[PDB]
Design a protein around this ligand. Structure first.
Ligand SMILES: O=C(O)[C@H]1O[C@@H](O[C@@H]2[C@@H](O)[C@@H](O[C@@H]3[C@@H](O)[C@H](O[C@@H]4[C@@H](O)[C@@H](O[C@@H]5[C@@H](O)[C@H](O[C@@H]6[C@@H](O)[C@@H](O[C@@H]7[C@@H](O)[C@H](O[C@@H]8[C@@H](O)[C@@H](O[C@@H]9[C@@H](O)[C@H](O[C@@H]%10[C@@H](O)[C@@H](O[C@@H]%11[C@@H](O)[C@H](O[C@@H]%12[C@@H](O)[C@@H](O)OC[C@H]%12O)O[C@H](C(=O)O)[C@H]%11O)OC[C@H]%10O)O[C@H](C(=O)O)[C@H]9O)OC[C@H]8O)O[C@H](C(=O)O)[C@H]7O)OC[C@H]6O)O[C@H](C(=O)O)[C@H]5O)OC[C@H]4O)O[C@H](C(=O)O)[C@H]3O)OC[C@H]2O)[C@H](O)[C@@H](O[C@H]2OC[C@@H](O)[C@H](O)[C@H]2O)[C@@H]1O
Ligand SMILES: *[C@@H]1O[C@H](CO)[C@@H](O[C@@H]2O[C@H](CO)[C@@H](O)[C@H](O)[C@H]2NC(C)=O)[C@H](O)[C@H]1NC(C)=O
Ligand SMILES: *[C@@H]1O[C@H](CO)[C@@H](O[C@@H]2O[C@H](CO)[C@@H](O)[C@H](O)[C@H]2NC(C)=O)[C@H](O)[C@H]1NC(C)=O
Ligand SMILES: *[C@@H]1O[C@H](CO)[C@@H](O[C@@H]2O[C@H](CO)[C@@H](O)[C@H](O)[C@H]2NC(C)=O)[C@H](O)[C@H]1NC(C)=O
Ligand SMILES: *[C@@H]1O[C@H](CO)[C@@H](O[C@@H]2O[C@H](CO)[C@@H](O)[C@H](O)[C@H]2NC(C)=O)[C@H](O)[C@H]1NC(C)=O
Ligand SMILES: *[C@@H]1O[C@H](CO)[C@@H](O[C@@H]2O[C@H](CO)[C@@H](O)[C@H](O)[C@H]2NC(C)=O)[C@H](O)[C@H]1NC(C)=O
Ligand SMILES: *[C@@H]1O[C@H](CO)[C@@H](O[C@@H]2O[C@H](CO)[C@@H](O)[C@H](O)[C@H]2NC(C)=O)[C@H](O)[C@H]1NC(C)=O
Ligand SMILES: *[C@@H]1O[C@H](CO)[C@@H](O[C@@H]2O[C@H](CO)[C@@H](O)[C@H](O)[C@H]2NC(C)=O)[C@H](O)[C@H]1NC(C)=O
Ligand SMILES: *[C@@H]1O[C@H](CO)[C@@H](O[C@@H]2O[C@H](CO)[C@@H](O)[C@H](O)[C@H]2NC(C)=O)[C@H](O)[C@H]1NC(C)=O
Ligand SMILES: *[C@@H]1O[C@H](CO)[C@@H](O[C@@H]2O[C@H](CO)[C@@H](O)[C@H](O)[C@H]2NC(C)=O)[C@H](O)[C@H]1NC(C)=O
Ligand SMILES: *[C@@H]1O[C@H](CO)[C@@H](O)[C@H](O)[C@H]1NC(C)=O
Ligand SMILES: *[C@@H]1O[C@H](CO)[C@@H](O)[C@H](O)[C@H]1NC(C)=O
Ligand SMILES: *[C@@H]1O[C@H](CO)[C@@H](O)[C@H](O)[C@H]1NC(C)=O
Ligand SMILES: *[C@@H]1O[C@H](CO)[C@@H](O)[C@H](O)[C@H]1NC(C)=O
Ligand SMILES: *[C@@H]1O[C@H](CO)[C@@H](O)[C@H](O)[C@H]1NC(C)=O
Ligand SMILES: *[C@@H]1O[C@H](CO)[C@@H](O)[C@H](O)[C@H]1NC(C)=O
Ligand SMILES: *[C@@H]1O[C@H](CO)[C@@H](O)[C@H](O)[C@H]1NC(C)=O
Ligand SMILES: *[C@@H]1O[C@H](CO)[C@@H](O)[C@H](O)[C@H]1NC(C)=O
Ligand SMILES: *[C@@H]1O[C@H](CO)[C@@H](O)[C@H](O)[C@H]1NC(C)=O
Ligand SMILES: *[C@@H]1O[C@H](CO)[C@@H](O)[C@H](O)[C@H]1NC(C)=O
Ligand SMILES: *[C@@H]1O[C@H](CO)[C@@H](O)[C@H](O)[C@H]1NC(C)=O
Ligand SMILES: *[C@@H]1O[C@H](CO)[C@@H](O)[C@H](O)[C@H]1NC(C)=O
Lengths: 160, 185, 160, 185, 160, 185
């Protein structure tokens, strides 16, 4: 099957339906809010990594607020819901890219194109890591302009 | 800094994955040889590639561990997922276990051409930790042994950020590449 | 993977390509015909429960008419085709909603918005059950107007 | 009755799932303590939460049952799916079985703080039946035992409508949360 | 989960982003190039067989060029990536169609509608085999005109 | 030839699957009774439906084969997938094995009404080979036995084109329909 989990309502005034990451979530970067479009983009996509991560974040938040921590781990919830939260073979694809020797996803850093004036964001995607280091921004500049073109086209099409 | 087109900016995210300490085990490493998996804020495991063996007996007292349920269920499930994702594992002499008192100890002998248990065991290591001369889907390391063992929680993984993706991905491939040892099963 | 089963042709004059439920299928409600749009909606969707059920219905009908009952069960067919008929983790999502304490799908009652004049229907979705009882229609009225807006938008877009 | 906007009406469906009796097992219950699974129109199983034990021996003669293939394959597959979906099952003393003559009998001891086999066994019960003071993903019941046993078919589940979804969902999680008891497997 | 593998860049001048099959791939038919649209069609589809096959082809090509053959098989790669390359239950659907007695996919011959003037192709789909022989082109002529209508509609919609 | 609408043509493809000999095992058959699986360009296996038995002992020395790792890992994984996809296998008397020297030999006794190991074993045969009076998901053949055995590589499958789809599909259903033989597992 595929993932079926849905994102819990987020207490962000600017973004009613979009998962907003708090201070604790982002290392040394305070709070940022994404919006409903970016988070809802992968309700059909199986090839995005960051929205799977924010689904993990939302599942953790639900499990904390609406159950009891009890100070001992309940692996039952995550083992049951892992296929309902994240794609199961995207990690396989990145493992294969790693074995072959092409740049693979780190799963720690994610990059996105923050629209300065309006504050919209693309759904962040993994910063490629290779040869034991992060790829230079020059190396995947082409992918950056790819995402820029995607954002412009999607926005213009949806607005009309 | 990094400005694209006219207004789009390459603003980046560094997800603090310690916020998932209460539900998911996180993987991070210290010096490219000491890998770690932390579950909760109280318990974790060492993953050390070394030439020194802490265990000198070829046993894995799993049914004894299940009889005396004095261990942590999370750690046993972690090592179960790890052992069910080892591709084409066929030599049981290599693996050694210690569970007395609830302690989690697992040692692996990486002694060896390819088609060796060391190949698949390193494969699942980098499946889990994601931290790392072998070719054609065969990998060799100078380290003779590897140790997994129980430990408390600290911040001792400067090299790598903690992430859960290694365990979630390892859950996918468990029992996938297993050999048949009995007809009935 | 995902489901791959396709709906068998249904002997309904009004609805050529849409699974029509006979008298036996619906408790004390005679026969209703849905249409091709509603049944074909979830050829990409993994988050609907009723069309998975009607895929189970169509698989049962095929297995009965084109094989022999023999009076003893053949669990082989269902065990092989369960992943080809229904989503595998939607039941997980509803089990999780049940454990947490939010209203979960019953999988027995399904509600839909029958268009009285034309006879179109939305794809029925599960009537939420909680606290050992059915939720009042007032409680999920918002979801009802959600589906109404969805139906209007989809119909207008497809017509143009 | 329930009219929305101007013309849309909340017409509801009550799917008669008895039409799937010839291919799928259906789950329904009578008084919140007697759950049932009916396969075909001839055979079904009792699921009774009770303080009385029908079995006083800690055996499960599974390989003997497979040797003498005099049982119904559907029922054995049902109980196999049920037993392979029990999360983190590690205490085999609890489960007891009887298969003489093709009869299907399975008893469970729910004796116990949490992290108990009772927790996971109740979890899979409500995974299957979907009919039902415990918190934080731990559930306790006053009933000491549970019984699964063979029976004929009647209409004795007034409380709950028959549905197959419990078994189809249980098929997903089989072998997912299993512990390793041998290195080779 | 679902497949996540992505098609490697193909050295075809006419088709930059579309997997082009060389002489060795096609029996006694030299080289044909498909295009980006046909190969990218099933980045959401789970019910197509030929593009899964060309994903297998591309995985084999990657495994050969960027690893070493060593003259002994490495089943590890295929056993790990099989769920990341092909759908897992489409073969189940065709096995079921075979058992029931309806024409099933062979998985050897695939038919497609080559546009003679422009050279576009539909994504090839399996030539049905039944009763121990290939179905006559007359039998599934209706499916052929189905695909023709699909191609015309998709092309016209995308062009606008 | 086959022209549709005005310009669309029914041009067909015959995929040469020998190009996948270096990564995937290919299935093809010669005379509807000799099926074959070729892995690499050096080794393959016979699948012969016959009334003659090459083996007269009811053993399968699997743990002895794993102890002396002198066999080909690809072939053992092939037969492991084959044996873990046999629906509801419950009679272990039928299967017989020979592995001396690295040779792969597996014989099956198809002796028998339905609900027989022959039914499921033929089911998985046509799951793999896809080459082929029984009804209602029960299949019977006049052949008493079947043989799987090691062989070199030739072009001896005129009847059927080589294809990998049988093994890839068989990998899906492994361990899916297995019976429980022990509580702990
Ligand atoms: O196959 C098949 O499938 C099949 O077959 C068949 O036939 C067979 C054949 O086959 C063959 O075989 C062979 C063999 O011999 C082999 O084997 C082996 C292998 O495997 C390998 O091994 C390895 C090893 O070596 C290594 O080392 C080791 C170490 O490690 C260590 O270990 C340890 C251990 O020991 C332990 O264990 C245990 C545990 O487990 C636990 O147990 C528990 C118990 O206690 C409980 O109780 C039980 C019960 O159950 C009961 O049983 C019963 C019975 O009795 C019945 O019967 C009856 C009669 O009696 C009369 O009455 O009549 C009626 C009937 O019924 O039945 C029932 C049934 O059905 O089921 C049963 O039940 O009583 C007894 C008891 O015991 O129970 C439980 C449960 O259930 O669960 C259990 O759990 O505790 C105890 C212990 O002891 O543990 C420990 C720990 O802690 O952990 C450990 O440490 O030491 C030792 C060493 O050795 O290691 C490795 C690893 O790790 O991995 C291994 O691997 O190698 C060697 C060898 O030897 O193999 C081979 C090959 O493969 O190649 C072969 O050839 O010949 C024989 C024949 O027989 C069969 O038969 C079948 O079986 C079935 O049937 C019979 C029965 O008996 C059974 O059961 C079944 O199964 C099969 O299936
Ligand atoms: C594990 O994560 C939890 C939640 O992300 C942390 O819990 C918070 O810890 C801070 C530390 O001062 C407290 O102020 C908060 O009240 C805690 N919140 C909750 C919900 O527990 C916890 O600190 C993390 N573990 C460690 C060792 O830092
Ligand atoms: C790890 O494996 C190595 C090699 O398989 C073991 O070394 C062997 O030990 C035996 C017993 O003394 C000797 O007879 C062999 O000659 C050794 N071979 C080599 C290549 O060193 C080693 O003992 C194993 N580790 C443990 C803890 O048993
Ligand atoms: C795992 O089980 C084996 C079972 O034999 C244990 O080996 C026994 O250990 C006790 C401990 O004093 C000895 O008295 C026995 O003589 C040992 N058995 C044999 C056959 O010699 C082994 O100790 C267990 N593992 C651990 C870590 O305790
Ligand atoms: C199980 O379901 C089947 C089909 O849904 C029922 O079979 C029908 O039963 C009625 C009862 O009079 C007959 O008139 C029909 O001819 C039957 N149809 C078929 C296709 O068998 C069956 O009755 C159900 N079982 C029970 C106990 O009611
Ligand atoms: C079900 O479990 C309970 C508790 O684990 C068992 O009760 C124990 O029985 C033994 C044997 O007589 C006594 O020594 C213990 O003191 C009992 N403990 C408790 C808490 O009652 C009970 O016997 C088990 N059921 C069966 C059928 O064996
Ligand atoms: C399951 O298998 C065990 C195997 O021991 C059976 O226990 C034996 O039962 C017979 C029946 O008369 C006795 O004669 C033996 O003495 C028992 N074995 C021992 C070691 O005492 C058990 O009966 C089987 N289960 C059932 C329900 O029959
Ligand atoms: C197995 O497939 C491989 C690659 O598809 C074949 O290898 C080629 O064989 C031809 C034969 O003359 C050589 O010219 C090529 O150089 C080979 N290419 C590679 C990449 O090895 C091989 O021939 C096939 N096996 C058999 C028995 O035909
Ligand atoms: C394959 O199965 C058949 C039937 O199960 C076996 O034939 C039996 O052999 C025994 C031993 O001689 C006789 O006592 C039975 O009367 C035979 N039954 C029948 C129906 O022929 C046959 O032996 C098995 N094959 C092998 C190699 O053992
Ligand atoms: C599989 O293992 C069995 C274990 O018993 C082997 O049977 C033994 O074979 C040796 C060979 O000379 C005999 O000396 C023993 O007497 C046999 N055991 C018994 C109990 O009689 C069997 O040979 C093995 N399979 C193969 C193909 O060798
Ligand atoms: C990335 O750029 C730095 C300089 O900014 C350079 O030192 C480094 O070598 C570059 N990376 C690679 C892989 O060349
Ligand atoms: C772990 O987190 C819990 C929840 O905030 C807290 O109560 C507990 O003290 C923490 N553990 C330690 C060792 O601080
Ligand atoms: C472990 O042993 C190997 C070979 O014996 C050798 O590289 C060295 O002694 C040890 N490895 C390291 C990295 O020190
Ligand atoms: C991601 O990059 C950081 C950069 O410091 C590194 O520490 C971490 O190990 C990388 N992730 C993985 C999985 O290696
Ligand atoms: C639903 O409405 C009925 C009255 O129509 C009321 O008795 C019942 O309490 C309501 N449900 C809840 C959960 O309040
Ligand atoms: C079960 O259904 C079949 C098919 O209609 C029927 O022949 C049989 O009599 C039914 N069983 C009983 C006990 O009525
Ligand atoms: C079963 O035993 C428990 C505790 O011993 C007690 O609630 C009662 O005796 C029984 N339970 C019920 C529901 O009657
Ligand atoms: C669905 O609601 C009906 C209402 O009577 C109830 O009988 C049935 O048990 C419910 N379904 C489940 C799975 O509990
Ligand atoms: C297909 O057509 C041929 C003649 O072209 C005919 O001989 C054959 O019987 C036809 N197939 C079927 C199934 O009738
Ligand atoms: C198998 O293919 C390899 C790769 O081309 C080749 O080197 C080898 O000679 C082939 N095997 C045989 C028996 O020709
Ligand atoms: C195998 O035996 C059967 C029945 O004994 C009989 O058809 C014949 O002797 C053999 N089968 C064939 C196809 O020759
Ligand atoms: C596909 O058709 C060809 C036609 O010759 C045949 O040889 C082959 O066996 C068929 N495929 C299968 C899987 O039977």
């Amino acid at each position: 099957g595929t993932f079926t989990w849905t994102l819990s309502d987020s207490e962000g005034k600017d973004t009613p339906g979009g998962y907003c990451l708090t201070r604790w979530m982002l290392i040394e970067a305070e709070l940022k809010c994404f919006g409903n479009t970016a988070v809802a983009k992968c309700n059909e996509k199986h090839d995005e990594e960051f929205c799977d991560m924010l689904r993990l974040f939302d599942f953790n938040k639900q499990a904390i607020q609406r159950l009891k921590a009890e100070a001992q781990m309940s692996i039952q919830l995550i083992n049951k819901a892992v296929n309902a939260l994240i794609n199961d073979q995207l990690i396989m694809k990145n493992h294969l890219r790693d074995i072959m020797g092409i740049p693979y996803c780190n799963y720690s850093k994610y990059w996105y194109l923050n629209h300065t004036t309006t504050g919209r964001t693309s759904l962040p995607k993994c910063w490629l890591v290779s040869n034991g280091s992060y790829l230079n921004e020059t190396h995947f500049s082409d992918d950056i302009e790819q995402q820029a073109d995607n954002m412009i086209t999607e926005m213009l099409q949806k607005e009309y | 800094t990094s400005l694209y087109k006219g207004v789009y900016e390459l603003q980046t995210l560094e997800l603090n994955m310690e916020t998932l300490n209460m539900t998911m085990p996180l993987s991070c490493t210290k010096n490219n040889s000491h890998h770690y998996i932390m579950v909760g804020n109280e318990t974790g495991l060492e993953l050390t590639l070394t030439n020194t063996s802490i265990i000198n007996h070829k046993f894995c007292n799993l049914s004894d561990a299940h009889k005396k349920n004095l261990y942590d269920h999370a750690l046993m499930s972690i090592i179960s997922t790890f052992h069910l994702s080892i591709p084409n594992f066929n030599q049981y002499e290599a693996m050694s276990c210690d569970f007395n008192g609830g302690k989690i100890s697992v040692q692996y002998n990486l002694s060896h051409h390819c088609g060796t248990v060391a190949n698949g065991v390193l494969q699942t290591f980098m499946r889990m930790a994601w931290g790392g001369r072998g070719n054609w889907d065969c990998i060799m390391t100078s380290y003779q042994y590897l140790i997994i063992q129980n430990t408390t929680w600290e911040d001792h993984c400067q090299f790598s950020r903690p992430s859960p993706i290694g365990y979630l991905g390892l859950l996918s491939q468990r029992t996938r590449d297993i050999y048949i040892s009995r007809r009935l099963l």
